[PDB]
Design an enzyme around this catalytic site. Structure first.
Site, PDB file in Angstrom:
ATOM      1  N   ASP A  88     -40.292  -0.153 -41.277  1.00  0.00           N
ATOM      2  CA  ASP A  88     -38.921   0.023 -40.799  1.00  0.00           C
ATOM      3  C   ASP A  88     -38.995  -0.133 -39.282  1.00  0.00           C
ATOM      4  O   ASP A  88     -40.000  -0.620 -38.749  1.00  0.00           O
ATOM      5  CB  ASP A  88     -38.337   1.365 -41.249  1.00  0.00           C
ATOM      6  CG  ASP A  88     -36.820   1.314 -41.476  1.00  0.00           C
ATOM      7  OD1 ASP A  88     -36.049   1.201 -40.498  1.00  0.00           O
ATOM      8  OD2 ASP A  88     -36.395   1.398 -42.649  1.00  0.00           O
TER       9      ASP A  88
ATOM     10  N   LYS B  87     -37.785   8.222 -47.710  1.00  0.00           N
ATOM     11  CA  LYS B  87     -37.778   7.766 -46.323  1.00  0.00           C
ATOM     12  C   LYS B  87     -38.609   8.734 -45.493  1.00  0.00           C
ATOM     13  O   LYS B  87     -38.675   9.923 -45.805  1.00  0.00           O
ATOM     14  CB  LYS B  87     -36.347   7.665 -45.781  1.00  0.00           C
ATOM     15  CG  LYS B  87     -36.200   6.876 -44.488  1.00  0.00           C
ATOM     16  CD  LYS B  87     -36.480   5.400 -44.630  1.00  0.00           C
ATOM     17  CE  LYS B  87     -35.504   4.697 -45.545  1.00  0.00           C
ATOM     18  NZ  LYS B  87     -35.326   3.279 -45.109  1.00  0.00           N
TER      19      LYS B  87
END
Ligand SMILES: NC(=O)c1ccc[n+]([C@@H]2O[C@H](COP(=O)([O-])OP(=O)(O)OC[C@H]3O[C@@H](n4cnc5c(N)ncnc54)[C@H](OP(=O)(O)O)[C@@H]3O)[C@@H](O)[C@H]2O)c1
Ligand SMILES: NC(=O)c1ccc[n+]([C@@H]2O[C@H](COP(=O)([O-])OP(=O)(O)OC[C@H]3O[C@@H](n4cnc5c(N)ncnc54)[C@H](OP(=O)(O)O)[C@@H]3O)[C@@H](O)[C@H]2O)c1
Ligand SMILES: NC(=O)c1ccc[n+]([C@@H]2O[C@H](COP(=O)([O-])OP(=O)(O)OC[C@H]3O[C@@H](n4cnc5c(N)ncnc54)[C@H](OP(=O)(O)O)[C@@H]3O)[C@@H](O)[C@H]2O)c1
Lengths: 467, 467, 460
Positions: B182, B142
């Site tokens: 995202d 991430k």
């Protein structure tokens, strides 16, 4: 959902006369940047004029077209090599890496004494949009050298190819730039260059296309352009001529090289009757048509003997040869014309003959075979013309399928490659019609091919931030 | 056999109480290393507690779990960029490369002022085990930045994206780290970052997912999570409920965004009847269900008009709207509940309603929709709950299929992508069932998803020498 | 000769035969690049200066021809966004001409006139000038048609960063070390260095002209003027039997950095600078270090004419519209073609024995014939004004050594470079039978070191 609108100075709709004025300003700008690159200026002019309908909807597209006209990267380099007499020779090498928006730079290599920067820029610029039309992830490029293979021994070609690749390898790679063959670069040269690239890179990758099937090559490469021409015309006949097909149609083919030969083979598979072949000396005519067996005889004569078409008369009593005449002159009903010989081979007078003989569709296997006035005759007569930039893209499409096979480390069967090529031509034909309809020139497949090729590149270029 | 046994200090079976103490010691150790990473400590705790049955068989798995909680690599970097006023701005960029045991680091990028290391570590840690569940060769990661897109021009986001990728490109690659979108990183940002990466690397590769179909993107991306939820539930119904199916089942769906819309569409393909949709204002109800035509109207209202669910009554005379109530309140038998709105939306009282209304299975489209107290109600009632970390993984699964297409240099048809997504959900459902039966109890799919995701990473970690 | 068998042309040739062969070489160059006017002229001029070498062995003309093809040319699109937010596209170039003696070395020019023909002509000539410095530097040149005028500092920063984003792929401390030129000064060198360091994640001497705080060298502003005086002084000792600048009245043209620092070093050697000049006129004082400082401050800060300084010195005299002032050593440091035939006859009558060229090609061909007949030595500019490129090489040495030299050490090395350069020019002139012709000797020495090294390395 336009994130790049603010970057462009020109915007909004424009009249037809306003668009031509803007196109002239663009051409002059291109002229000032490269005052003596005659071929490149002409190519920019032709492509720009083919996109006028798009520029009328939004002038921002002309600015995008102009920014694409500057190559991302050009590498010119000295190539030293030693001939069989032991003397040092110096030639110039080029790789024009024009655009990589849709994928790695893709394009052939030309070894010919006429090669220079202007020629390679014109071929590479057009290659962006032909490769775009294949629907495959390929950018556009072109390269080569003024090295002249004629009169050179195999060993001298090996020496030059090794030296040429010694520099070129620094700038290419399987995900960066995948060169291919062209005039002067065939199986011999691709093999020599591949060996040098493998030795220096210490890798076995799909960094060249046109390779032999024994080491990373693909089936259907020789047949690709001729087969793809027939696939495209067949789909256009169904879509635009209400279910028509090649079955029962007499097909006048010009040329007698690989494109003409394999187009004839696929026409026969679809039930058409190829009646003519041609070369610069004249054309041959079979009143009841050529069979697959007869085409095989012609292929041996042209590909092994490199003979003239008149020689086929020795093998067929029914064949007739007409010297110093084009295939379009044949006295009989012709339902389909496939010019597969050279640029400007089908002129205004040829188009008038074919219309009266009953021709309903023209398919371009060669580059720009139909003169601008011949295209006007066909348009007035409502004879569909399938543009070469879409219809003869079968060769580069299979080059992309070759990249896919190398990326997959899997050799496809011949049947699978052929299915992939046909499906590509099916999707290419649909894209041309949809582009033509959206911009209000319905049935103009020539315009549809220009629009579809450009727009995928233009939209992706803005998606990527115009870098 | 066991080749890593000697490396671990903790080993052997343990009681439930011994495991609870060891988990506390592990949590305290994690806290001491990162005292103020509140979200990461909580993430470590929740995943650890779901794995107690595995730890009871062998405490070595707890030592492996603790070792996985330390990222392989975290890169933090200054991101300088110049805004539209010409002023220099400095933001912080991150890439947490947590684990690469099963494949390249895979995970989205978030641009939001709340972003910090603790949040990205919690999302990256959990992403390791969801990506494992897809059955695809993907690690976990991430990244993102505290850059705030709100109020920024397209050009300012372009400037930031280019400087951000100028550093990030150094640490990622098609075989190393493949980021994705995202919050704050959608197609605009993916396009800008892809252009910069391509320019700097001089390559066209699948180093980002979420790309446009024109340049390396995949079909089925909008539909992936909703379709995958329905595929997963369908397979659980067949395997665990003795040939049961969506056919004839009244399906209460919460939410009215992309997950809810496409879940309803796939429910109809399988013969189920979706009866409800919902948003924060209330829920709408169709006594005889929604058709594909009705879902299409709802999609237009939500995605274009940005309207509330009540607007649908304008288009259907049969529809009823109930303000300030959840979809679970609907007065009719519900056989399947699909919470696709937000975390904690289905509480103890809602679960008690659903059991009495006839609900046999719950499929989580949203993240943690079902409260702990609601899960206990479902367990007693023998209502299967399909955990979200498995059931809503369709989006990440299609991102893996995008990597496959890029590696193969071939764009798949919509149908081929959909078949592959369905096969992924079939193998995921089987693995969850088998893990639950082997280690805790048959039919506990929540436990099975926790175990199956973890064990593939842990066993592979030991195969690879725990490096 | 291990490369003798490689060459088609070989053996001695008469002067007329060399003229025939040179014409064949020029025609070959034209067909390859028909419209590169500046490059064709550059190939022509350099070839004619090497005719004595070609007469000894035609092999050298074939080597010269192979050197005329660049090893590598990179042209690239440079996209950048201006302060109005509009996308702009410019063309960037790096001509990497020759690396036989060392990394490609050469300036970057940002000017709307920039094109491939111009950069090839400058890069080709740079090969042989850098060879003359005795330092291990090849030849190159680059730049862009980007026009700095009217552009904000931020617009130059954005363009420089995009330009270097591509250029970094092709350069490096052992590969290619660019430098500044017209349109590329300290501002642009700084912006480009910042981009290169960020992308390469390294701090190396991949550019010269850098600030002393981060890898730069002293003597950078003074190099060309100081080196000119060093070169003429060494020629005076070597060819004029121990003569020197001391006591000699020096007519200096121009009022830029070259003329100013040449005057300063002339004073250090005991000479008396008697003239300075500008395009509007020339001043003559029958100048001191303090006066030169005032002249430099007045010209460099006020951007005034030389006549404005005449108000500040009562002994100074101004003549509107430098060689004409009459009095009992000439250093043209202003611009090309400033010294014509009549001026050379004026100076010979005034007694000048040596000319030192600070500017590029100050002396006309007819003036060179006048000086040759008068036995007045002319020191070619390509050697005498090479001090700037020599110090750029010393900057590379300091970066390689990770050591900043004192001003004194840089100055000593620059002086020693000119001592060895003057000797190499004289010895080459003697060997090819034109003794005292420093112009030919500079042409011969620069070429021969590259050509012999090229054959040593196998002609690749
Ligand atoms: N991948 C491909 O092969 C491909 C793809 C797209 C476009 N094209 C274009 O297609 C053409 C060549 O196709 P090919 O690969 O089959 O090349 P080829 O092997 O050279 O065949 C070209 C044929 O055209 C004939 N020809 C040339 N000028 C002629 C004229 N004035 N009248 C009649 N015949 C003439 C040649 O006969 P002679 O031997 O007498 O010259 C030869 O039979 C070129 O325009 C090329 O750019 C090729
Ligand atoms: N699509 C994916 O890639 C993906 C993957 C995994 C998990 N998920 C999860 O799935 C959930 C929804 O995803 P989505 O793509 O459908 O997002 P979305 O497009 O924002 O839709 C969310 C829906 O839930 C509703 N909602 C929010 N809070 C609610 C509440 N308190 N009560 C009732 N309805 C409420 C929203 O209505 P309002 O407009 O009134 O808020 C909206 O209609 C989220 O938890 C998300 O993280 C999504
Ligand atoms: N500086 C270096 O690094 C360097 C190195 C090698 C060679 N050079 C060469 O040396 C020459 C000048 O360099 P520089 O540093 O002196 O440049 P500069 O600092 O710009 O000064 C040049 C001066 O020459 C004057 N000028 C121009 N044309 C003239 C003419 N016809 N008569 C008299 N003066 C004239 C200008 O006077 P205004 O003020 O009236 O314009 C200007 O002040 C150029 O040819 C250059 O290529 C320079």
């Amino acid at each position: 959902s336009d994130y790049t609108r603010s970057l462009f100075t020109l915007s909004g709709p424009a009249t037809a006369s306003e668009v031509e004025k803007h196109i002239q300003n663009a051409i002059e700008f291109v002229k000032r940047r490269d005052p003596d690159q005659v071929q490149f200026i002409q190519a920019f002019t032709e492509v720009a004029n083919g996109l006028a309908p798009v520029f009328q909807t939004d002038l921002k597209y002309l600015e995008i077209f102009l920014s694409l006209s500057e190559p991302e990267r050009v590498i010119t380099f000295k190539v030293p090599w030693v001939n069989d007499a032991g003397k040092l020779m110096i030639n110039r090498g080029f790789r024009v890496q024009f655009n990589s928006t849709l994928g790695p730079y893709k394009g052939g290599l030309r070894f010919h004494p006429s090669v220079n920067l202007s020629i390679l820029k014109f071929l590479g610029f057009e290659q962006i949009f032909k490769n775009s039309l294949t629907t495959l992830a390929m950018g556009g490029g072109k390269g080569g050298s003024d090295f002249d293979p004629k009169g050179k021994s195999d060993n001298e070609v090996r020496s030059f190819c090794q030296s040429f690749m010694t520099e070129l390898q620094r700038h290419i790679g399987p995900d960066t730039d995948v060169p291919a063959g062209d005039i002067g670069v065939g199986e011999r040269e691709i093999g020599f260059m591949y060996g040098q690239y493998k030795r220096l890179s210490n890798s076995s990758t799909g960094t060249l296309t046109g390779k032999d099937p024994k080491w990373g090559g693909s089936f259907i490469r020789p047949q690709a352009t001729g087969y793809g021409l027939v696939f495209f015309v067949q789909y256009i006949l169904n879509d635009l001529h209400n279910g028509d097909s090649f079955k029962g149609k007499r097909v006048a083919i010009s040329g007698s090289g690989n494109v003409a030969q394999y187009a004839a083979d696929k026409v026969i598979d679809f039930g058409g009757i190829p009646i003519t072949f041609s070369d610069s000396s004249g054309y041959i005519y079979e009143p009841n048509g050529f069979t697959k067996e007869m085409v095989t005889v012609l292929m041996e004569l042209k590909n092994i003997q490199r003979a003239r078409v008149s020689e086929f008369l020795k093998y067929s009593n029914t064949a007739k040869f007409f010297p110093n005449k084009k295939a379009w002159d044949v006295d009989t009903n012709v339902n389909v014309a496939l010019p597969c010989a050279c640029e400007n081979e089908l002129d205004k007078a040829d188009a008038e003959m074919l219309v009266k003989k009953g021709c309903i569709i023209v398919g371009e296997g060669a580059n720009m075979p139909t003169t601008p006035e011949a295209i006007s005759v066909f348009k007035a007569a409502k004879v569909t013309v399938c543009p070469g930039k879409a219809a003869n893209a079968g060769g580069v499409a299979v080059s992309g399928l070759e990249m896919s096979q190398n990326s997959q480390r899997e050799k496809w069967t011949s049947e699978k490659v052929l299915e992939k090529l046909q499906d590509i031509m099916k999707n290419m034909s649909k894209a041309c019609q949809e582009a033509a309809a959206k911009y209000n020139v319905h049935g103009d497949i020539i315009s549809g091919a220009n629009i579809a090729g450009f727009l995928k590149v233009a939209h992706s270029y803005c998606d990527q931030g115009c870098v």
